[PDB]
């Protein structure tokens, strides 16, 4: 099945663009990554950086995860992110997102060997 590592790239990485360039980024991106296959994913964040730079977060600042888990990491640096929030007009299968671009610190959950990002926790 797809790995938690691969899932994360699919759901959260967007190295092809430096920022969202239009209000439709989210609608376009949530669809083509398959996040709207079974239901409207209510919220999702895309990171507009190198895979390598996101993977490095696993050896940055250790912080507790919002759920109390202790395998979270916070980026020393701010990163180009795209926030996607479902809209009041959202109706499955026509999922609708509000697109919000920001530069923030990203907090991820890391697991395995190689020890990499498996979960996007929050942006701070």
């Amino acid at each position: 099945k797809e790995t938690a590592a691969a899932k994360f790239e699919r759901q959260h990485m967007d190295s092809s663009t430096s920022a969202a360039s239009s209000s439709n980024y989210c609608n376009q991106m949530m669809k083509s990554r398959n996040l709207t296959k079974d239901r409207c994913k209510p919220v999702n964040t895309f990171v507009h950086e190198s895979l390598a730079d996101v993977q490095a977060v696993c050896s940055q600042k250790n912080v507790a995860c919002k759920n109390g888990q202790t395998n979270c990491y916070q980026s020393y640096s701010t990163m180009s992110i795209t926030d996607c929030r479902e809209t009041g007009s959202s109706k499955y299968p026509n999922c609708a997102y509000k697109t919000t671009q920001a530069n923030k610190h990203i907090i991820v959950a890391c697991e395995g060997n190689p020890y990499v990002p498996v979960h996007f926790d929050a942006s701070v």
Side-chain angles (χ1 to χ4, degrees), residues 33-68:
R33 286 300 180 84
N34 241 57
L35 305 172
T36 67
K37 220 200 183 57
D38 305 308
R39 63 204 180 81
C40 295
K41 192 184 160 184
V43 157
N44 192 70
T45 303
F46 300 90
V47 177
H48 296 285
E49 302 295 334
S50 207
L51 210 23
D53 292 346
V54 171
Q55 284 161 342
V57 172
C58 293
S59 72
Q60 293 179 14
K61 184 142 181 65
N62 178 233
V63 305
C65 313
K66 316 175 153 164
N67 80 332

Coordinates of all heavy atoms in Angstrom, one line a residue, residues 33-68:
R33 N -4.4 15.6 -6.3 CA -3.6 14.8 -5.3 C -4.5 13.7 -4.8 O -4.1 12.9 -3.8 CB -2.9 15.7 -4.3 CG -1.7 16.5 -4.9 CD -0.6 15.6 -5.4 NE 0.4 16.6 -5.9 CZ 1.4 17.1 -5.1 NH1 1.5 16.8 -3.9 NH2 2.3 18.1 -5.6
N34 N -5.8 13.6 -5.2 CA -6.7 12.7 -4.7 C -7.2 12.8 -3.4 O -7.5 11.8 -2.7 CB -6.2 11.2 -5.0 CG -7.1 10.5 -5.9 OD1 -7.5 10.9 -7.0 ND2 -7.5 9.3 -5.4
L35 N -7.1 14.1 -2.8 CA -7.6 14.3 -1.4 C -9.1 14.4 -1.3 O -9.5 14.4 -0.1 CB -6.9 15.6 -0.8 CG -5.4 15.3 -1.1 CD1 -4.5 16.5 -0.8 CD2 -4.9 14.1 -0.2
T36 N -9.7 14.4 -2.5 CA -11.1 14.5 -2.4 C -11.8 13.3 -3.0 O -13.0 13.3 -3.3 CB -11.5 15.8 -3.1 OG1 -11.2 15.6 -4.5 CG2 -10.9 17.1 -2.6
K37 N -11.0 12.2 -3.0 CA -11.6 11.0 -3.6 C -12.8 10.5 -2.8 O -13.9 10.4 -3.5 CB -10.5 10.0 -3.7 CG -10.6 9.2 -5.0 CD -9.8 7.9 -5.0 CE -9.8 7.1 -6.2 NZ -9.3 7.9 -7.4
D38 N -12.8 10.3 -1.6 CA -14.0 9.7 -0.8 C -14.8 10.7 -0.1 O -15.9 10.5 0.2 CB -13.5 8.6 0.2 CG -12.7 7.5 -0.5 OD1 -13.1 6.9 -1.5 OD2 -11.6 7.3 0.0
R39 N -14.1 11.9 0.2 CA -14.9 12.9 0.9 C -14.2 14.2 0.9 O -13.0 14.2 0.4 CB -15.1 12.5 2.4 CG -13.8 12.4 3.1 CD -13.8 11.6 4.3 NE -12.4 11.6 4.9 CZ -12.1 12.6 5.8 NH1 -13.0 13.6 6.0 NH2 -10.9 12.6 6.4
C40 N -14.7 15.3 1.4 CA -13.9 16.6 1.2 C -13.0 16.6 2.4 O -13.4 16.7 3.5 CB -14.9 17.7 1.1 SG -15.9 17.8 -0.4
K41 N -11.6 16.6 2.1 CA -10.7 16.7 3.2 C -11.0 18.2 3.7 O -11.0 19.1 2.8 CB -9.2 16.5 3.0 CG -8.4 16.3 4.3 CD -6.9 16.2 4.1 CE -6.1 16.5 5.4 NZ -4.7 16.5 5.0
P42 N -11.4 18.4 4.9 CA -11.8 19.7 5.4 C -10.7 20.8 5.3 O -10.9 22.0 5.1 CB -12.4 19.5 6.7 CG -11.9 18.1 7.2 CD -11.5 17.4 6.0
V43 N -9.5 20.4 5.6 CA -8.2 21.2 5.7 C -7.0 20.4 5.3 O -6.8 19.2 5.6 CB -8.1 21.7 7.2 CG1 -6.7 22.0 7.6 CG2 -9.0 22.9 7.5
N44 N -6.1 21.1 4.6 CA -4.8 20.5 4.2 C -3.9 21.7 3.9 O -4.3 22.7 3.5 CB -4.9 19.6 2.9 CG -3.6 18.8 2.7 OD1 -3.3 17.9 3.4 ND2 -3.0 19.1 1.5
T45 N -2.6 21.5 4.2 CA -1.5 22.4 3.9 C -0.5 21.9 2.9 O -0.1 20.7 3.0 CB -0.8 22.7 5.3 OG1 -1.8 23.1 6.1 CG2 0.5 23.5 5.0
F46 N -0.1 22.6 1.9 CA 1.0 22.3 0.9 C 2.2 23.1 1.3 O 2.2 24.4 1.5 CB 0.6 22.4 -0.6 CG -0.5 21.5 -1.0 CD1 -1.8 22.1 -0.9 CD2 -0.3 20.2 -1.5 CE1 -2.9 21.3 -1.3 CE2 -1.4 19.5 -2.0 CZ -2.7 20.0 -1.8
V47 N 3.3 22.4 1.2 CA 4.6 23.0 1.4 C 5.3 23.2 0.1 O 5.5 22.3 -0.7 CB 5.4 22.3 2.5 CG1 6.8 23.0 2.7 CG2 4.7 22.1 3.9
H48 N 5.8 24.5 -0.2 CA 6.4 24.9 -1.4 C 7.9 25.1 -1.3 O 8.5 26.2 -1.4 CB 6.0 26.3 -1.8 CG 4.5 26.3 -2.2 ND1 4.0 25.7 -3.4 CD2 3.4 26.7 -1.4 CE1 2.7 26.0 -3.3 NE2 2.3 26.4 -2.2
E49 N 8.5 23.9 -1.0 CA 9.9 23.7 -0.8 C 10.5 22.4 -1.2 O 9.7 21.4 -1.6 CB 10.2 23.8 0.8 CG 9.8 25.0 1.6 CD 10.6 26.3 1.3 OE1 11.7 26.2 0.8 OE2 10.0 27.4 1.5
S50 N 11.7 22.3 -1.2 CA 12.4 21.1 -1.5 C 12.1 20.0 -0.6 O 11.9 20.1 0.7 CB 14.0 21.3 -1.3 OG 14.7 20.4 -2.2
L51 N 12.0 18.7 -1.1 CA 11.7 17.5 -0.3 C 12.7 17.4 0.8 O 12.4 17.2 2.0 CB 11.9 16.4 -1.4 CG 11.1 15.1 -1.2 CD1 9.9 15.5 -0.4 CD2 10.8 14.6 -2.6
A52 N 13.9 17.6 0.3 CA 15.1 17.6 1.2 C 15.1 18.5 2.4 O 15.4 18.1 3.6 CB 16.3 17.8 0.3
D53 N 14.6 19.8 2.1 CA 14.5 20.7 3.2 C 13.4 20.4 4.2 O 13.6 20.7 5.4 CB 14.4 22.2 2.7 CG 15.5 22.8 2.0 OD1 16.7 22.4 2.0 OD2 15.1 23.9 1.5
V54 N 12.4 19.7 3.7 CA 11.3 19.3 4.6 C 11.7 18.1 5.4 O 11.4 18.0 6.6 CB 10.0 19.2 3.8 CG1 8.8 18.5 4.8 CG2 9.4 20.5 3.4
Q55 N 12.4 17.3 4.7 CA 12.9 16.0 5.4 C 13.9 16.4 6.5 O 13.9 15.7 7.5 CB 13.6 15.0 4.5 CG 12.5 14.2 3.7 CD 13.2 13.5 2.6 OE1 14.3 13.9 2.2 NE2 12.5 12.5 2.1
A56 N 14.6 17.5 6.3 CA 15.6 17.9 7.4 C 15.0 18.4 8.6 O 15.7 18.4 9.7 CB 16.4 19.1 6.6
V57 N 13.7 18.6 8.6 CA 13.0 19.1 9.9 C 13.0 18.0 11.0 O 12.9 18.3 12.2 CB 11.6 19.7 9.4 CG1 10.9 19.9 10.7 CG2 11.7 20.9 8.6
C58 N 13.3 16.8 10.4 CA 13.3 15.7 11.4 C 14.4 15.8 12.3 O 14.6 14.9 13.2 CB 13.2 14.3 10.7 SG 11.5 14.2 9.9
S59 N 15.3 16.6 12.0 CA 16.6 16.7 12.9 C 16.7 18.2 13.4 O 17.7 18.7 13.6 CB 17.8 16.3 12.2 OG 18.0 17.3 11.2
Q60 N 15.5 18.8 13.5 CA 15.5 20.2 14.0 C 15.0 20.2 15.4 O 15.4 19.5 16.4 CB 14.8 21.1 13.0 CG 15.7 21.1 11.8 CD 15.2 22.0 10.6 OE1 14.3 22.8 10.6 NE2 15.9 21.8 9.4
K61 N 14.0 21.2 15.7 CA 13.5 21.4 17.1 C 12.5 20.4 17.4 O 11.4 20.4 16.9 CB 12.8 22.8 17.3 CG 12.4 22.9 18.8 CD 12.5 24.2 19.4 CE 12.1 24.2 20.9 NZ 13.1 23.4 21.7
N62 N 12.8 19.6 18.5 CA 11.8 18.6 19.0 C 10.8 19.4 19.9 O 11.1 20.1 20.9 CB 12.5 17.4 19.6 CG 11.6 16.3 20.2 OD1 11.7 15.9 21.3 ND2 10.6 15.8 19.4
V63 N 9.5 19.0 19.6 CA 8.4 19.7 20.3 C 7.3 18.6 20.4 O 7.3 17.6 19.7 CB 8.0 20.9 19.5 CG1 9.2 21.8 19.3 CG2 7.3 20.6 18.1
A64 N 6.4 18.9 21.4 CA 5.3 17.9 21.6 C 4.3 18.2 20.4 O 4.1 19.4 20.1 CB 4.6 17.9 22.9
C65 N 3.7 17.1 19.9 CA 2.7 17.3 18.9 C 1.4 17.8 19.6 O 1.3 17.7 20.8 CB 2.3 16.0 18.1 SG 3.8 15.0 17.6
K66 N 0.6 18.3 18.8 CA -0.8 18.9 19.4 C -1.5 17.8 20.2 O -2.3 18.1 21.1 CB -1.7 19.5 18.4 CG -1.2 20.4 17.4 CD -2.3 20.9 16.4 CE -2.0 22.2 15.8 NZ -2.9 22.5 14.7
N67 N -1.2 16.5 19.8 CA -1.9 15.4 20.6 C -1.1 14.9 21.7 O -1.5 13.8 22.3 CB -2.4 14.3 19.6 CG -1.3 13.3 19.2 OD1 -0.1 13.7 19.2 ND2 -1.6 12.0 18.9
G68 N 0.1 15.5 22.1 CA 0.9 15.0 23.2 C 2.0 14.1 22.7 O 2.9 13.8 23.5

